[PDB]
Amino acid sequence: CVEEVTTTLEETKFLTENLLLYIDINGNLHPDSATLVSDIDITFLKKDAPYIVGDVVQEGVLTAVVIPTKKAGGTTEMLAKALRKVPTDNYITTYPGQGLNGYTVEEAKTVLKKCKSAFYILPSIISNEKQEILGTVSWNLREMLAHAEETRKLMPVCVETKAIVSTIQRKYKGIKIQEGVVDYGARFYFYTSKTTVASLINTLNDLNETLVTMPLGYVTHGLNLEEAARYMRSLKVPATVSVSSPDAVTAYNGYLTSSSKTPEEHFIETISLAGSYKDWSYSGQSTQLGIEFLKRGDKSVYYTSNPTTFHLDGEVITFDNLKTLLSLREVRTIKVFTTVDNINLHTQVVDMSMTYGQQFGPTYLDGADVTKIKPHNSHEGKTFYVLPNDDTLRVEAFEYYHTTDPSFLGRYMSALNHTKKWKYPQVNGLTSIKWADNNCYLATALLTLQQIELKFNPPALQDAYYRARAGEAANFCALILA
Amino acid sequence: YCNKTVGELGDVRETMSYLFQHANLDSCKRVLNVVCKTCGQQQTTLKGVEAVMYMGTLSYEQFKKGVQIPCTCGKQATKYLVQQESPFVMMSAPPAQYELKHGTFTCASEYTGNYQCGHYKHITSKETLYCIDGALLTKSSEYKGPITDVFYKENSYTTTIKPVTYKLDGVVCTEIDPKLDNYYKKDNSYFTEQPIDLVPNQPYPNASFDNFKFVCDNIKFADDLNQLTGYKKPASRELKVTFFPDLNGDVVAIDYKHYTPSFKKGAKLLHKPIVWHVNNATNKATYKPNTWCIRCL
DSSP states (O other): OOOOOOOOHHTTTTTTOOOEEEETTTBBBBBBHHHHHTTTTOHHHHHTTTSSSSEEEEETEEHHHHHHHHTTTTHHHHHHHHHTSSSSSSEEEOOTTTTGGGHHHHHHHHHHSSSEEEEEEEESSSSOOOOEEEEOOOOOOHHHHHHHHHHHHHHEEEEEOOHHHHHHHHHHHTOSSSSSSSEEEEEEEOOOOOSSSSHHHHHHHHHHHOOOOOOTTTTTSSSOOOHHHHHHHHOSOOOEOOOHHHOOOOOHHHHHHHSSSHHHHHHHHHHHHHTTTTTTEEOOHHHHHHHEEEETTTTEEEEEETTTEETTTTTEEOHHHHHHHHHHOOOOOEEEEEEEESSOOOOOESSSSSSSHTTOOOOOEEEEOOTTOOGGGGGGGGGEEEEEOHHHHHHHHHHOOOOOOHHHHHHHHHHHHHTTOOOOOEETOOOOOOOOSHHHHHHHHHHHHHHHOOOOOSSEEEHHHHOOOOOHHHHHHHHHHH | OOOOOTTEEEOHHHHHHHHHHHSSOOBBBEEEEEHHHSSSSEEEEEEEHHHHEEEESSSSHHHHOOEEEEEESSSEEEEEOOOOOEEEEEEEEESOEEEEETTTEEEEEEEEESSSSSEEEEESSSSSSEETTTTEEEEEEEEEEOOOEEEEEEEEEOOOOOOOEEEBBEEEEEEOOOGGGOOOOEETTEOSSSSOOOOOOOOOOOOOOOOOEEESSSSSHHHHHHHHTOSSSSSSOOOEEEEEOOOSEEEEEEEGGGGGGGTOOOOTTTTTEEEEEBBBBHHHHHHHHHHHHHHOO
């Protein structure tokens, strides 16, 4: 018997003075049970400790049962049996598995209904009202059928699975196999392999029945476990999942662990794990008005759940709007130098989200094109040059220099500006260069050119070589590199 | 302005503080971050007055790496500084020794003397380390001695050193560069210990071995597994065991050398349950993990 009362603990004790409590394997009280008997000595719970995972301790009017938490591992019917270990009588208790244990309200109510004892229920401090729709268990087929029969749930079965159908007939003798719904102890639904998984899911959604079923597609259609989990998540009605392999049950649980909470609480937990968001600082502390959210500067944000809304400076902002606003904090900015006469003082500030060309236009750096390149950290403090586009000028430059590169001029100018910084002394009438930026092979090529017969087709290149042999090697080297 | 007299002893710290009070550096900005173990982390932003000076022997890189400070809760907290828009930062502390070389710092000053009488010397660099004591000049490339006065040069700096916050099944902790990837993560929560990345397993709470049968080509191994279960006829269910790398069976045999801390609760390869063997046989060091894995089954 299950009944919820609005009376206080002492008033409810008039109906029955017996109390039912929940403890761990070491006898430590769970928060609800701890608050229930906080004024009574609890050493008798740990007196017989350590226990197996699932046990019962009784003394006087106090009764306790050992239950684990879903963080380590747990199931519904195992909890029901652990509570069934308690002798049948009238007790006052909260919903089992609430709070840190992770069991939902519906699971706790079903467990209490399965128990033969009569329970008087008080509200829990931390209630898991949100329902875990998908739950995987290691119970075999017979236990699945018993659970479905006791909870009056429906189990869809594929007729092509000969072993499972044979086992069902062995347990529930006399049942016929055909495309229809059969009610004999447990509720059954049979179908052929021709029915697709999506059609079966749509039919189950239309029926709106609570289910205890194998992972759809994994056993009936040969799909992998992840696909079966995704299909079950597409299913709306709650269901209980079980397979012959406990390792598959653990894999399904691991699949269910990701993206388990609601999107607002999942986002809050993601921020807590990151400890920040772009430039905000997460606190996660509780106040009398609300729980704290991420903080930037001297202003903090606070949120209240169900519905999860955020408060800032007396204003309420929805979860979606706040998330969208936080996502727009990808503003990476850098400060770079720009010039025309190359000796003046001029500075530009650019954002790293877009490329150099998208914001300004044709830009080059030391012969490297940066028009279609997004900056990084090392680009801070660099110097850049910008030149407009003119196809006629490029055609004339090609006619003069016999080169078809449309980006030749910008790279050439950028390289020339850097090379002008260098010094070119001479040794024995031959140009020498101080080592910088791996100029050894360039100097070797210069030495080779200084000693050989040499002519060029472009007159500009010939004049540049003439100047280089006279000491103006910077322009010639820049042209060669370009 | 210092409101002192002729021949009166003075502190460089207070003199520089007064100078900066009468100086004009309001545009300077400095942001610091403080990380505590359990309680929480905070961000500190300072203006030009606070940016220029700090109490400590920390250098620029030492301040970047982090500092150790006591928290209000009694635990130890870590504080680091990555932010700067200012020409210089000054560091000072109670007397201590230091070692410096040319190019590793801007300038420093030396103080050696008692509480009622002391001498001050300064170190500066043009080509190498230069020290001046009134009318005396000292030149060297390296130096080491008791020095507590630090001046550093910077234009602007910012990097991506950030703290990380995590929860361990009931407890929230904040650390700098923690090894959380070794744990198993459920949605936004980590588990107790650190295994290799694998599917977790769950043992039966206070339940028996379920009285199921093991079948394998290695009849001795199957019988050992059955003895682990306390098998008694009839069998509730039957499973078949295959040895690595043969994964076609219901259960997979794994050598004990692949043991991980989480395997004390349960072990898994793929979605199937696994068992442990040594020399194609069971032993106590595998008997206990096999007992726990069967409890999972």
